[model samples]
Target: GQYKMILNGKTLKGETTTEAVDAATAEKVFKQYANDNGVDGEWTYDDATKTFTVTE
Candidate 1:
């Protein structure tokens, strides 16, 4: 499985290989991502689907 983020128009890919990595995975780390980027995005890992999502 691969995880890519479509957040704030920033194109990024985690290249997440094998294992579950949707909302349940990213909500934690996603926040860190936003924190590091200095972006105030209360990102939501949208669905159980493959692609990562962010909602602000």
Candidate 2:
């Protein structure tokens, strides 16, 4: 499979070249963000903007 992580209009590189992690898989990390901070957060995808955001 192919995966890429883009943040703030920049492409993110993981330990590997491409992200190699899908959104469903990455959501766990975002979920932990809320858990660790005890704040509500979400990983949202915007089709119109072709972007994603993990925010509280």
Candidate 3:
């Protein structure tokens, strides 16, 4: 199978804190986002923008 995709990671969608983020919230959002988008891959978070990115 050919698997070529980019997982545009995103925050929990509700919880945004500079100090720390809620694990549960992040997990929930990640799962939902992945499922909703049919994304299959790993992603990283950006502390500066507090968002996720799909680095090339």
Candidate 4:
């Protein structure tokens, strides 16, 4: 699978955490990390390309 999620210069490929199984799960993890760490950005996932976009 070519799925990948990237935020704040950090890129996650495949499962990173126990809850992560795919791109959507990866998105949530990134979003939670951002909120927990006070990172500023809005997250979006592209299903076709498997790309996670974060807008700051």
Candidate 5:
């Protein structure tokens, strides 16, 4: 359960504003971060850190 959502410099792992968001709906968070930041790119994961990063 080490999944994480990594954007620009923000990290959304086990908490979203102090509440828990499992990896299941974590994809939703991805959209918000990406679109707001105008980040249009594929996603890549660094298994070492359990991070899903935006690939430019």
Candidate 6:
């Protein structure tokens, strides 16, 4: 497979809201960024590790 990217991954990085949001909201923001940047992927959050993972 071959693909060309307009915007590289992690080009836009930040929280959607300064006030913070729920897991669902975070996922929404993540997906939005990916779509807006012509990218597609999924996100995984680990509450215990306080980290997030992405897959495309």
lDDT of 1 by residue, 1-56 (tens): 45556666244423332243555565556556756766555454535655555544
In order of appearance, the predictions have TM-scores of 0.46, 0.39, 0.39, 0.49, 0.50, 0.47
Q: Between which residue pairs do clashes occur in model 6?
A: none
Q: Write the per-residue lDDT of candidate 5 for residues 1-56, one digit (tens) a residue.
A: 54666554333323222122564455666667677867676776564765676654
- lDDT at residue 13 of model 4 (Cα atoms): 23
Q: Pick the TM-score winner.
A: 5
Q: How big is the positional error of residue 53 in model 2, measured in Å on the Cα after superposition?
A: 3.8
Candidate 3 collision pairs? none
lDDT of 1 at 49: 59
Please give the RMSD of candidate 4 to the true structure: 5.4
Cα lDDT of model 3 by residue, 1-56, tens digit:
11122354453223322222554455456555566855555656554445543422
Candidate 2 residue lDDT tens string, 1-56: 23332332123322211332565655455445345645444456554533445443
The order of the candidates by TM-score, greatest first, is: 5, 4, 6, 1, 3, 2
The Cα RMSD of model 3 versus the native structure comes to 11.1
**In model 4, which regions exceed 4 Å deviation?**
1-3, 8-19
Point out the higher-scoring one by lDDT: 3 or 4: 4
Worst lDDT run of 10 residues, candidate 5, spans: 11-20
lDDT of 1: 0.52
lDDT to native, each model: 0.52, 0.42, 0.44, 0.58, 0.55, 0.47
By lDDT, is 1 or 5 better?
5
Q: Any residue pairs clashing in model 5, and if so which? A: none
- Candidate 4 structure, TM-score to reference: 0.49
In order of listing, the candidates' clash counts read 1, 0, 0, 0, 0, 0
Enumerate residue pairs that collide in model 4.
none
RMSD to the native, candidate 2? 7.0
Worst 10 residues of 1 by lDDT: 9-18
Candidate 1 residue pairs that clash = 1-18
